[PDB]
């Protein structure tokens, strides 16, 4: 199924995923299309931050849902 992700610039990218894909898998797919490493990504769906180790279905993310990509902040 397809899902959409709004990038840092407000642009829209489309991903091909399965309800059982993990957030890590999704971030990997985002790196493939946008070039941003997974550990620099932070995904939000309906105001909720998506956590690694969980799947899309865990958040009720369905066909054509839109996620939001924001910067994962960190020290150093």
């Amino acid at each position: 199924m397809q899902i959409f992700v709004k990038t840092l610039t407000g642009k829209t990218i489309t991903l091909e995923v399965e309800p059982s894909d993990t957030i890590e898998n999704v971030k990997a797919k985002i790196q493939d299309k946008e070039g941003i490493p997974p550990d620099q990504q932070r995904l939000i769906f309906a105001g909720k931050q998506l956590e690694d180790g969980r799947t899309l279905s865990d958040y009720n993310i369905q066909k054509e849902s839109t996620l939001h990509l924001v910067l994962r902040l960190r020290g150093g």
Binding site: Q40, L71, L73, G75
Partner: protein, 117 residues
């Protein structure tokens, strides 16, 4: 030999003086004077990571880690007597350092005299 200035007594200071900017440091690899990180292993002072969208620092501290492997760094200006922001490149997270006082003292830094900037 020096004499009291004829201006000392009545020197007119400005009414609304913009409190001078607190003291600070500068990355040793660029001109940044904010978002600076002191590595607890060698005392190097380098700027914070550069983010994907261009925000952040100039990536010097993290590059230093990649080259040396020295894991801990404390963010200058966050040091108070009770603690400070310490990042672990190794564990990829903000961490606590029970021995921060000793670690900072190693480089002649009184963790008690430092003021949060």
């Amino acid at each position: 030999v020096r004499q009291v200035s004829k201006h000392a007594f009545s020197l007119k200071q400005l009414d609304n003086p913009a409190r001078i900017p607190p003291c600070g440091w500068k990355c040793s690899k660029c001109d940044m004077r904010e978002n600076l990180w002191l590595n607890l292993t060698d005392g190097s002072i380098l700027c914070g990571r550069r983010y994907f969208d261009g925000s952040g620092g100039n990536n010097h501290a993290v590059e230093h880690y990649r080259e040396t492997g020295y894991p801990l760094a404390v963010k200058l200006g966050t040091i108070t007597p009770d603690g400070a922001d310490v990042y672990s490149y190794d564990e990829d997270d903000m961490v606590l350092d029970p021995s921060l006082a000793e670690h900072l003292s190693h480089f002649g830094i009184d963790m008690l005299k430092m003021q949060k900037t």
